[PDB]
Amino acid sequence: YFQQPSLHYTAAQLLEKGVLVEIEDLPASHFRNVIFDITPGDEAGKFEVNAKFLGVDMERFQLHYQDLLQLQYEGVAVMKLFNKAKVNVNLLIFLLNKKFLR
């Protein structure tokens, strides 16, 4: 309404980057039609992830950089977003760093 860094990527773009690993029960051919938008949240290290899967708006949720670091420290390779999307923790950290923390 008033007249602001973000990331807007399809699942297919995130696959190509190695950030997305799989989406359970979704054929690869549909990855172009899954869209992620990531913006900085309302706390340090917090990012708000919005998504639209095949035209359907998903419930916003919150990624915390410190949680990703804890996964990485624990040797966990992947984290699940929206129940069925698996993302590579190392490459998500790298994308968040490159696009936001720099």
Side-chain angles (χ1 to χ4, degrees), residues 17-51 53-79:
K17 291 172 187 294
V19 176
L20 185 61
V21 170
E22 76 173 36
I23 303 177
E24 211 193 354
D25 301 317
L26 193 63
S29 68
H30 291 280
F31 283 15
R32 290 180 97 208
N33 301 120
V34 169
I35 296 98
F36 296 97
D37 285 287
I38 306 198
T39 50
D42 73 350
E43 295 181 338
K46 182 172 190 184
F47 300 87
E48 185 165 279
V49 186
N50 278 288
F53 276 60
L54 314 187
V56 178
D57 296 314
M58 310 299 290
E59 191 63 24
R60 232 160 59 206
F61 75 97
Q62 304 304 315
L63 272 179
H64 293 272
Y65 196 85
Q66 184 61 31
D67 292 339
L68 296 176
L69 293 186
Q70 179 64 34
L71 287 180
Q72 181 187 63
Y73 181 83
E74 291 166 349
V76 171
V78 309
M79 85 153 286

Side-chain angles (χ1 to χ4, degrees), residues 81-82 84-95:
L81 307 183
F82 306 104
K84 288 186 173 171
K86 285 186 164 193
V87 293
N88 180 264
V89 170
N90 287 342
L91 287 168
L92 181 55
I93 290 168
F94 180 63
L95 190 68

